[PDB]
Ligand binder design. Structure first.
Ligand SMILES: Cc1ncc(COP(=O)(O)O)c(/C=N/[C@H](CCCNC(=N)N)C(=O)O)c1O
Ligand SMILES: Cc1ncc(COP(=O)(O)O)c(/C=N/[C@H](CCCNC(=N)N)C(=O)O)c1O
Lengths: 351, 351
């Protein structure tokens, strides 16, 4: 009863199973056509699916990577020559912090209330070479609103600061489907976006990170990318294209309704308990934070393990101040509903 | 007419076509069995296929990565924690150098004749924390013989040096099919090997790098691997498993015969031209160097392009002295014979 890893483990839909049934046809197509044609079609399907109409479609402005984390490694190393300090949203997915810090960058935490609620201080922006924002954020689900993205982008441009976005959870929240690329190109900061197909669908970790960057980024992303790969499998791009097309023809709506149901299953199952609260009431992400007073997320985690239920304590996400996450756990929602409901039912009895 | 990229673009055999036809069955399998089980089966079939029987089969000793270059990035960044200087075979695939140099390692080139023909000097082993050998080497095809691998491993153990091997081309040459792991364990040096499935078969870049290391490696490979990925798709591991089994069942002998045929087609078209010569007469790799007098490899490439034939100039492999490769191009042999044959007929008239 794994509710820890955020990737999708629910069954395929009928439309998605039909895609999988035609994998030999996609293989034939991948053998027959220029990879670039399929990649263009995959990018267009995925970006247009999620409202990113102004993405740069000239071949080579979007670099297909095996994963978001590969893209992130390329970005961190590309930053490390010219940047000492990154302002990083806190909490966020902890590997972002480990990848930046492992490549020699010093991190400055920016709390969410500060990031979403007001302009960043000039003193901060002038003291960092990059601002890095996960939107929708993991674990909180919080979406950087369009006006805030615009003001942040403008401020980064004013300060010569790179604006980097990790938009991996984009597909789950329509609030994140306004055209980010329009905003960034309009603002004219040096920017980079890491899109990710890998959390949306149960494609057995067949996915791509998509590293997108402004023409003036002034970082060696293209070169270091080239150092790591020539490209991703056309079969995976064809897969992405088809899953995006199925998503465009109602699949995406069905996925939102399914995550909403599982989020509901979780909140109904725990609402009467303690002492329990749900810090992110408006989140539509595929992961869910749960907070409780009295006990520690680590304790709760330890006890759930005894019952073969595996969630995540939240300490790891508060990468600058782990005690900040002492009283919360994270629960994965991209799960078949029956196994998910068993999981939180154990959680309820433990509490 | 692409004869540049090393990856395989020849037609599927009947038996490989049959594996592609079962991709939906392998998908359902991947959904239903623990990834670790499939991974162990994939590893066992690939290592055993190529004679690497003493590979450490305990889970977690073989780290499955999206590609050999991802494995290489992990190794490079791990080395930089405690190593300043790496001795690297020269020429070799230039990403190996660009990844090491880009993670902050200083490179000492070791020409192939030094590496294969004599012990490494005490002066050299006093100055480097790692020796890195690509075997079979790309682009030369040169195979590190068992006697030299043993002696190299003995010297690394004596000095405390890490011995690192890149064995992506292993499957093409039966001279590389003696058990490298037995040699490395016998010597007791710190060692790391990057195996790669992606050059052998036309799998549309569905592949894994396999990062294997001694228990005393004393480098943070497990931590850095974990920061970049959790694992590779079970569908890709299942495919590796099935392609390795088809190869054990005669595929591999047929592939050796196919590559030999195509090498003969190239040499048939060219060995009487000019001024033309073949630097690596004994190579059995899927890539082939051609030398010429008078003109430059870059200039041959430009003329080939005009006729829509894309080969590779060799400068980039001589990563410490590119002018060493000024008079050579590389030709990909993992190609359908007819396109390859058109390609060299064009290259013939050019020369
Ligand atoms: C905002 C964000 N950006 C990037 C990544 C990197 O994903 P990647 O592994 O490279 O495919 C994550 C990962 N989230 C983790 C899944 C861990 C990887 N899952 C997997 N099985 N491949 C989580 O939320 O549990 C993330 O939340
Ligand atoms: C000894 C060696 N170790 C690692 C690599 C990295 O392999 P990877 O691209 O990560 O799957 C190569 C690559 N050889 C290059 C292929 C270029 C990549 N092709 C692709 N389509 N992804 C060649 O010889 O042409 C190599 O020769």
């Amino acid at each position: 009863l794994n509710i820890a890893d955020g990737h999708a483990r629910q069954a395929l839909s009928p439309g998605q199973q039909k895609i999988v049934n035609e994998l030999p046809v996609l293989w034939a197509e991948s053998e027959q056509r220029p990879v670039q044609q399929i990649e263009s079609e995959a990018h267009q399907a995925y970006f247009t699916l999620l409202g990113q109409h102004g993405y740069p479609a000239e071949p080579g402005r979007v670099l297909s990577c095996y994963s978001s984390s590969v893209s992130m490694e390329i970005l961190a190393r590309s930053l490390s020559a010219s940047v000492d300090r990154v302002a990083l949203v806190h909490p966020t997915f902890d590997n972002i912090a480990d990848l930046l810090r492992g490549n020699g960058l010093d991190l400055v935490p920016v709390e969410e209330d500060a990031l979403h609620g007001a302009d960043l201080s000039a003193e901060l922006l002038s003291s960092v070479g990059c601002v890095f924002v996960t939107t929708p954020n993991n674990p909180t689900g919080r979406v950087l609103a369009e006006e805030r993205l615009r003001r942040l982008a403008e401020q980064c441009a004013e300060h010569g600061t790179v604006l980097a976005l990790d938009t991996s959870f984009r597909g789950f929240d329509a609030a994140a489907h306004y055209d980010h690329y329009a905003v960034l190109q309009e603002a004219g900061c040096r920017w980079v976006v890491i899109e990710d197909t890998g959390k949306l669908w149960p494609t057995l970790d067949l996915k791509a990170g998509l590293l997108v960057f402004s023409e003036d980024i002034g970082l060696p992303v293209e070169k270091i990318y080239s150092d790591i790969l020539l490209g991703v499998s056309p079969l995976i791009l064809a897969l992405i294209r088809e899953f995006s097309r199925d998503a465009a023809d109602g699949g995406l709506a069905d996925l939102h309704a399914f995550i909403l149901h599982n989020r509901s299953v979780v909140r109904r199952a725990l609402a009467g308990v303690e002492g329990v609260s749900f810090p992110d009431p408006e989140s539509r992400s595929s992961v869910e934070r749960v907070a409780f007073a009295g006990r520690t997320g680590t304790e709760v985690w330890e006890e759930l393990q005894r019952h073969h239920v595996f969630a995540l304590p939240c300490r790891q996400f508060h990468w600058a101040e782990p005690s900040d996450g002492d009283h919360m756990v994270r629960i994965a929602l991209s799960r078949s509903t029956e196994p998910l409901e068993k999981s939180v039912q154990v959680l309820r009895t433990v509490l």
